[PDB]
Automatic annotation (TrEMBL):
InterPro entries: CarD-like/TRCF_RID, CarD-like/TRCF_RID_sf, DEAD/DEAH_box_helicase_dom, Helicase_ATP-bd, Helicase_C-like, Mfd, P-loop_NTPase, RecG/Mfd. Its EC number is 3.6.4.-. One of its GO terms (cellular component) is cytoplasm. GO terms for molecular function: ATP binding; damaged DNA binding; DNA helicase activity; hydrolase activity. In the C-terminal section; belongs to the helicase family. RecG subfamily. It comes from the Bacteria. Its main location: cytoplasm. It comes from Mycolicibacterium smegmatis (strain ATCC 700084 / mc(2)155) (Mycobacterium smegmatis). This is Transcription-repair-coupling factor. The keyword Cytoplasm applies.
Length: 1154
């Protein structure tokens, strides 16, 4: 890492007061209380870090994060954070594996500071009060991790058992941390503390090569190198035999997913589960220690604001024991709580004494006075508080101080905001430069240094003053089929999946995908016709299976004829748009670039590339019609603010149409904030605004006063005018009424419009309408979203009260889902009864419109704490402060509905929690037990995410066509849409099988690809290739993911190129009557070619009525006549024959190596 403020903090250590605390602390006193500003806690930690390692305690997790960031800018990798659990010690939710990974990684780095592979020697460790008080087993650090380096001699099967012992989960394909996949001689693994997963390849019993790969495409990333990888545990325990028998003995005491015996049942088998972290007093009984024991001998502890630490310690212990009583009551189990109390938080004083008994001095740094403590010659910096005279004063203070001869520095944490400070100090008659990172400022010149610093510092002893940016502005910084699923075939129709079998027939082992029709008949799909299959989605009620008659071809012509209306209307809109006139927008105003600097975050590659795509067709004379795809939390609204600024800065006006007045208020706040500091007049007209401001300010638009307006369907009333409007922005267009979507659909050729949406479209659809509907989707995340912690189980009032109280404690909100409106007020009264300190309001669709928009207006404005709403209200609400979801009667919801409800919580830097609760008065049905278990798991959900694409397809195509999506399938429907849109788009400018049955053992061995879903995917991936460069990319993908191709795989791709050569000359079938002959079915031979056939292939004849060429197979050798040629030797012979029967002459062949 880089240390940008390392030289400025060293200049800060020029102060003899901190030099006094370095000398004073080198003698390791028992007590040492320090007084100073909060902005100095990075300086005093840097001071104490000069004599040896140091532990620093902060009250909150955020204060520890800010301190880790500031200290990291000083010592680099020598500073690390010991994170706090996102759960309580006895809560039945396990913490995230990223946090337990970092925790145990740091404990190992503390025990092994000279280990290069772990990192630089730790100088400062920063932690919170929770991690300080939360005890832990003294043998966590002694758990041997899985170290993987080049040349290390481990045995493949042994490390797999070690990885499951470390609580890694063996899954089909890795996609999250803690998962590991196993191929032949290749195991993919994703350590919980790593940026990317690594692909380990062995040669015998040692690691041959190690590559880091990506999750999206599973392909290796060659631009990053790896030397060693350390696989720390994914849970804070080791899966041993002692915990397996102690769980089975505890299972004899208590012989559904959310039940205690279900945990112990899987713990008897050795499989970890959520909530396990509450049974260690019973699973691994051991005298628990605390964090200070793991620091090296003599390392001190510096507590920052001990008063705030004590109040936070009180709330933690109270919250911890509340979760213990709730999640481990006798009613919850259907277990001695005081044996579990050994793992719970210990008091502030028990932790302080434990630190002193272990050799670690307990020192404090506070900002409140004390005559007993040493005060530092340091005071905080002036804050501007959003004033201009404040800012001019601070600038005049820095100018006077450098004229003194003293040091001054403005530290900028933001990106692209240091030059602006240099300009602001030039405006204030003060010279200043941008300092190279790591250096200290020079006496007499104000130095602007980019670095992490939340607040400034004044050290008169060091003749130095630091101001930070916050001090000046005031703003902080794959087809998977299980037995019985319904699939569709393009040539036959709806069938039922049975199994996958392999039946060697004509001297070759072939795999077949067996299906079921009307239970009479089974269809055996070969591995080359897999492109004609797709999983049936679309019909909620499963339709009846088809047959071998002629009814399927009609439902396809019904599809196509229905699909053709869509494509025609879409190309007609594209033609009427590119043909009609449109006033283009000029180039970028100079102010536009300054606004791009005002963005307080880093742009994604997709955001910037989309930013150029929105600016291209605005600068072009074309009437714009583009949608922005990608779900919430991305840079979507930002591209709207720039497109709106570029349109206002060219004379035109902007209108922003939203379907909700909450979106009006949200986008208004986002727009006004960004376009401040510029003469961009912006107002808003929604449901809740008086006619005094509506009629006059907003609706009184004729003189061109308001440049940009964000409003609802109220902006579509008769009587609205726009003096030279040039841009229209519509977010979530599908949520308008039919009476209003006609208006927005009308205003498309007249004015450049730009729509926004979060419902995704399939990747096939986006490629299908690439020329008809201009589309710019973004997928690069600004910050990585970490998954919400999901508990599924029985409805218990004490657990519901603990989770709700845990949100209100963090000043957060919560969603409480109750779908039956007839009894929705009965549910709110129950929540008010459980949490009497919560503002609890309801919201549903059967409510009139004004109360609903007012109820959720208040909810967003934090006037209510819990919103008891229905499924359809909750999914259409962006409340970033609501990070707990509670769903009563979770068995009543489709899996896709649970995914959508869960998606709208925990989408920020603070982690969310979701509770899916079923009733405790009745036993669950046969439909729900596995669906809810499928939600607990981090392939059965893929059937529900394909649903979320269907609704998006109905919004971009403009029709539901529910009768045609079912009965032919949605995958077939998107492919018929793309074909009809390709025909109509081609008409707007004036413009199958290859059956091969040969004795060639060509298949993908299960030794090569064990997963059926992954092997079936590989079959389809090669069957769908078109040229030799495609089949070469499929082979490059297969050796990357699974290893070198075995002989049956090399033969299989060799046949794949044979089909591409067959189609090159239009051949449909190569088959063998027996061992003796071969027949090429569709081939017309001229007289000259018949002379070639009799010449070089004697014994072969040509049948002209069926256009087939029959040629006898040669023999392998000239021996007694036992072996007939076969396998790839035969493949090239056939490839040669077809080359000479067309006049090529065996001169362009490749299949020798495969």
């Amino acid at each position: 890492v880089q240390t940008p403020i390392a030289g400025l903090v060293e200049l800060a250590l020029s102060d003899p007061s901190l030099q006094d605390v370095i000398r004073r602390a080198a003698d390791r006193p028992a007590d040492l209380a320090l007084v100073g500003p909060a902005s100095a806690r990075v300086l005093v930690a840097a001071a104490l870090a000069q004599n040896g390692p140091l532990l620093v305690v902060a009250a909150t997790g955020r204060e520890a994060d800010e301190l880790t960031a500031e200290l990291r800018g000083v010592f680099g990798d020598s500073v690390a954070l010991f994170p706090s659990w996102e759960t309580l010690p006895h809560e039945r939710l396990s913490p995230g594996v990223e946090t337990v990974g970092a925790r145990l990684m740091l404990l190992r780095r503390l025990a092994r500071p000279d280990d290069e592979t772990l990192g630089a020697p730790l100088r400062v460790v920063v932690t919170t009060t929770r991690s300080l008080l939360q005890p832990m087993a003294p043998d966590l650090v002694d758990i041997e991790p899985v170290t993987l380096s080049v040349g290390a001699e481990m045995e493949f099967e042994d490390v797999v058992a070690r990885l499951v012992d470390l609580s890694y989960t063996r899954v089909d394909m890795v996609g999250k941390r803690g998962e590991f996949a196993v191929r032949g001689g290749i195991l993919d693994v994703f350590p919980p503390t790593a940026e990317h997963p690594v692909r380990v390849e062995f040669w015998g019993d040692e690691i041959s090569e190690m590559r880091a790969f990506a999750i999206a495409d599973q392909r290796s990333i060659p631009e990053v190198p790896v030397q060693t990888v350390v696989a720390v545990p994914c849970r804070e325990l080791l899966m041993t035999d002692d915990v397996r028998e102690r769980a089975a003995a505890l299972a004899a005491e208590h012989p559904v997913p959310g039940t205690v015996p279900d945990m112990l049942a899987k713990l008897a088998e050795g499989i970890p589960v959520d909530g396990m972290e509450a049974l260690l007093p019973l699973l691994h009984p051991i005298e628990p220690t605390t964090l200070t024991r793991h620091l090296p001998e003599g390392a001190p502890v510096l507590v920052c604001d001990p008063e705030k630490v004590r109040t936070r310690a009180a709330d933690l212990i109270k919250t911890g024991r509340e979760f213990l009583e709730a999640s481990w009551s006798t009613a919850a189990v259907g277990i001695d709580l005081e044996a579990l109390g050994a793992s719970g938080f210990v008091t502030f004083e028990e932790a302080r004494e434990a630190a002193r008994e272990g050799g670690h001095p307990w020192w404090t740094l506070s900002q409140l006075s004390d005559e007993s403590a040493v005060e530092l010659d340091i005071r905080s910096a002036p804050s501007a508080r959003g004033s201009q005279h404040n800012l001019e004063e601070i600038f005049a203070m820095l100018r006077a101080h450098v004229a003194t001869g003293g040091y001054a520095a403005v530290v900028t944490p933001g990106i692209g905001t240091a030059h602006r400070v240099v300009e602001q100090l030039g405006e204030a008659d003060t010279a200043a430069t941008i300092l190279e990172p790591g250096t200290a400022p020079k006496a007499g010149v104000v130095g602007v240094l980019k670095g992490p610093l939340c607040s400034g510092v004044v050290l008169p002893g060091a003749n130095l003053v630091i101001i930070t940016e916050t001090d000046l502005t005031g703003n902080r910084v794959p087809l998977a089929l299980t037995a019985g699923d319904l699939v569709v075939h393009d040539q036959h129709g709806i069938g039922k999946f049975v199994e996958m079998t392999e039946r060697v027939v004509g001297g070759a082992r072939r795999e077949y995908l067996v299906l079921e029709y009307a239970g009479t008949d089974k269809l055996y799909v070969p591995m080359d016709s897999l492109d004609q299959l797709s999983r049936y989605v679309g019909g909620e009620a499963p339709s009846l299976s088809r047959l071998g008659g002629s009814d399927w071809a009609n439902t396809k012509t019904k599809a196509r004829r229905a699909v053709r209306e869509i494509a025609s209307e879409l190309v007609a809109l594209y033609a009427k748009r590119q043909s009609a006139p449109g006033h283009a927008f000029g180039p970028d105003t100079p102010w536009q670039a300054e606004m791009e600097d005002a963005f307080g975050f880093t742009e994604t590659i997709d955001q910037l590339t989309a930013i150029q795509e929105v600016k291209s067709d605005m600068e072009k004379p074309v009437p714009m019609d583009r949608v922005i795809c990608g779900d919430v939390g991305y840079g979507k609204t930002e591209i709207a603010v720039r497109a709106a600024f570029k349109a206002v800065q060219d004379g035109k006006q902007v209108a922003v149409l939203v379907p909700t007045t909450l979106l009006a208020d949200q986008h208004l706040q986002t727009f006004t904030n960004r376009m401040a500091g510029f003469p961009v007049t912006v107002k808003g007209l929604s449901r809740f605004t008086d006619p005094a401001e509506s009629r006059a300010v907003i609706e009184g638009l004729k003189d061109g006063s308001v440049d940009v307006v964000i409003g609802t369907h109220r902006l579509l009333q008769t009587g609205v005018t726009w003096k030279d409007l040039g841009l229209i922005i519509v977010d979530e267009e599908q949520r308008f009424g039919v009476e209003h979507k006609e208006h927005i659909k009308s205003m498309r050729t007249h004015v450049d419009v730009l729509t926004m949406s979060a419902t995704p479209i399939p990747r096939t659809l986006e490629m299908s309408l690439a020329g008809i509907r201009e589309m710019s989707t973004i997928l690069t995340p600004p910050e990585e979203r970490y998954p919400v912690l999901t508990y599924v189980g029985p409805h218990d009032d004490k657990q519901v009260a603990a989770a709700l109280r845990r949100e209100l404690l963090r000043d957060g909100q919560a969603f409480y889902i109750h779908n039956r409106v007839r009894t929705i007020d009965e549910a709110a009264a129950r929540v008010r009864q459980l949490v009497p300190e919560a503002r609890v309001v309801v919201a549903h669709g059967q409510m009139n419109e004004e109360t609903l928009e007012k109820t959720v207006e208040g909810f967003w404005n934090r006037e209510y704490d819990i919103l008891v709403c229905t499924t359809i209200v909750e999914t259409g609400l962006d409340i970033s402060n609501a990070n707990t979801l509670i769903v009563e009667r979770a068995d009543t919801f489709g899996l896709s509905q649970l995914h959508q409800l869960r998606g709208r919580v925990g989408r920020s830097r603070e982690r969310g929690y979701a509770y899916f609760l079923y009733p405790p008065n009745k036993p669950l049905t046969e439909t729900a037990y596995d669906r809810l278990a499928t939600i607990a798991q981090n392939a059965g959900m893929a059937v529900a995410m394909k649903d979320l694409e269907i609704r998006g397809a109905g919004n971009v195509l403009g029709a539901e066509q529910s009768g045609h999506v079912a009965g032919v399938g949605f995958d077939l429907y998107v492919r018929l849409v793309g074909e009809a849109v390709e025909a109509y788009r081609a008409a707007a400018d004036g413009k199958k099988d290859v059956r091969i049955d040969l004795p060639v053992d060509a298949h993908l061995p299960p030794e090569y690809i064990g997963s059926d879903r992954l092997r079936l995917e590989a079959y389809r991936r090669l069957a769908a290739a078109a040229d030799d460069d495609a089949v070469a990319s499929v082979v490059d993908e297969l050796i990357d993911r699974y290893g070198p191709l075995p002989e049956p795989a090399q033969r299989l791709v060799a046949v794949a190129r044979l089909r591409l050569l067959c189609r090159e000359f239009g051949i449909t079938e190569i088959g063998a009557v027996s061992a003796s002959t071969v027949r090429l079915s569709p081939m017309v031979l001229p007289d000259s070619a018949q002379l070639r056939l009799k010449r070089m292939y004697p014994g072969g004849h040509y049948r002209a009525t069926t256009s087939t060429v029959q040629v006898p197979l040669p023999r392998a050798g000239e021996g007694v006549g036992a072996p007939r040629i076969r396998d790839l030797e035969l493949v090239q012979w056939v490839a040669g024959l077809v080359l000479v029967l067309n006049g090529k002459g065996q001169g362009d062949v490749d299949m020798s190596k495969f």
